[model samples]
Target: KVFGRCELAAAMKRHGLDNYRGYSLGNWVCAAKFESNFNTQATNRNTDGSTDYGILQINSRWWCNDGRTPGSRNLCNIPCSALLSSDITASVNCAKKIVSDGNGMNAWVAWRNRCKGTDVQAWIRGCRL
Candidate 1:
């Protein structure tokens, strides 16, 4: 499923992403917009033999176990396919683990290049969160 901006914002907020680890809800919304365009099944293959999965683009290299990413740490301890599901519970939980693991939201390059230091409030402007 492809989530509308505000729809995703509300979902993320429900999962406690608002100000999670000091990152605003807008930052999470903006990152999801760029990372996977809010598509639940999006996937991006990396040049390093790993793949990014789901809306937040959690990587198989270290976060999820895709069984194809050589030497994957599987820190999230979940099958990467879980990230592709429309439920998004697995994705959100793993995302929190990523942030809590000291990586912060910067774990996503899209966040670093697009959301960081940017005014992202517009990403959630119409959301009645």
Candidate 2:
């Protein structure tokens, strides 16, 4: 499922991503925009053999277990495939864990390169929170 900009913003807010870990919902939304373009089925394989999955692009290396990434912590205790579902609860929950694990939003390079220090509010403008 591909979500519209404001639609995705509302979904994130409903999932409690508004200001989790000092990062605003806009930050998460912006990162999602740059990372997966709000596509639930988005997936990317890194050269290091880890795969990123779903809307927030949770990685197999540390978050989700793909049964392939060696030494995977699987901190989210979910299969990487779970992230690809239209129901984004698992992806949102895993992303919260990622931020709570001290990695913060910087864990996503897309956030660093495109969202960090920027006016993230623009990403959610006109959206009724």
Candidate 3:
């Protein structure tokens, strides 16, 4: 629900998601823009019958537990419903672990398709923080 990029940056900083795994905050900002447009309640049902959740759109395939999605690793041990809230702590924590697990931001298709190999500086360019 962030209406401004600066606000989003500050929020991410508060959640300790500004940077990790050598990825820039710009990368995260841009990736979230494409993933969920900073909408904490965002949800998208995948063709595989699983769904993406929260601002970072963590997938049920390997991240959160969606109850009915079989084979979900639930690596974050967080229910998918937990992500669809204004509180982004669980989603941010899960996203951090995902990046830590390897492949970094490449774990997100939105990052690879929209933010990767592109000039993402504008994502955090005017953020004073």
Candidate 4:
């Protein structure tokens, strides 16, 4: 399901990312906005030929597979399809692992380009959470 900002925030909080790993909740919210606009089934094909999947725009090269890619680290051990579900539990779990693996939000290009060093409070503005 597509989520409203507050609903996304609540899910992130429940997943333990309210302010995870030195990143603000606002940063996470902002990244999600740019990455997938909180659409759990989102996917994008970049010019580099790698595909990103789900709300966090996780890359197929390292995180999951399109099955046609031939090889994948699949570090999260999850199918790319799994990331494209209305329920994003698998996506959330993999995202947590990606952060814990030390890439932090830098792992997501959207976060780097849109949220890094920016004041992201407005990303969750008026959410009342």
Candidate 5:
């Protein structure tokens, strides 16, 4: 039941994306695949930008240290784990926020669709897994 990373990239290709090099691929894919399989409507609520909401790719979750409540469900601040609570839409949206100006989504789609490699380390120079 382990969906391959390349498969994820392919799913994104169907949406017209570019690439996910030098970015948070593991978290991005984890959130998308884990929640909505690249569905754009994926959503959830950690309540803020610090918690993982849309995808299990939770990143902030009281990690931003932006003077906000530490771990108070700040989905937007972090990766939005609350989304893992059952909200693919939130996860995807949160992921969209993770990237500067919500640009990673397109690239993530590309990563899921046009790139793949065994060495995740090489993910920066265009994956081949």
Candidate 6:
């Protein structure tokens, strides 16, 4: 298991590709929770065995490859280019970018729905320093 909090924050700051200048790390906890379940090496799938890749559960081909190339965005997919980048922060940053005009956590509708459904306060409470 990876260290929590500080580790995540550091990842975001150094490896993440985003405009998260003031956003709190906690504002993204839910995404982190659901992305890899804190398991940085996590990988999941869907019912049809498509659309859902793994590790940050990213549909790599669609996003990383500019929504075209497939099976070429994972650890084995492309060197220094897994899902988002060689790091989780870049992955989440890409996920965030897809949702909005590059602000806050622009997570997928389904993913955000899970965050909202789980405990709205979880994001808020964890965010508040």
Candidate 6 residue runs with Cα over 4 Å from true position: 1-3, 14-24, 51-55, 65-81, 84-86, 101-110, 117-129
Candidate 1 accuracy as TM-score: 0.97
**Cα lDDT of model 4 by residue, 1-129, tens digit:** 788888898788778777777777788888889999999888888776778998888888888877855655788888899998877788888888898886688888888998898998777677766
129, model 1: CA deviation in Å? 1.2
Each model's lDDT: 0.93, 0.93, 0.85, 0.83, 0.41, 0.48
In candidate 4, stretches whose alpha carbon ends up further than 4 angstroms from where it belongs are none
lDDT of 5 at 30: 46
Question: Regarding TM-score, does 1 or 5 come out ahead?
Answer: 1
Please provide, for model 1 over 24-111, each residue's C-alpha lDDT reduced to its tens digit, 9 standing for 90 to 100: 9999999999999999999999999999999999999899899898777898999999999988889999999998887788789999
**What does the lDDT come to for candidate 4?**
0.83
lDDT of 1 at 116: 94
Candidate 1 whole-model C-alpha lDDT, 0 to 1: 0.93
- What value of lDDT does candidate 6 attain over all alpha carbons? 0.48
Between prediction 2 and prediction 6, which has the larger lDDT?
2
What TM-score goes with each of the models?
0.97, 0.97, 0.93, 0.90, 0.34, 0.52
RMSD of each: 0.8, 0.8, 1.3, 1.5, 9.6, 5.8
- By lDDT, is 2 or 3 better? 2
Q: What is the lDDT of residue 60 in candidate 3?
A: 93
- List candidate 2 stretches off by more than 4 Å: none
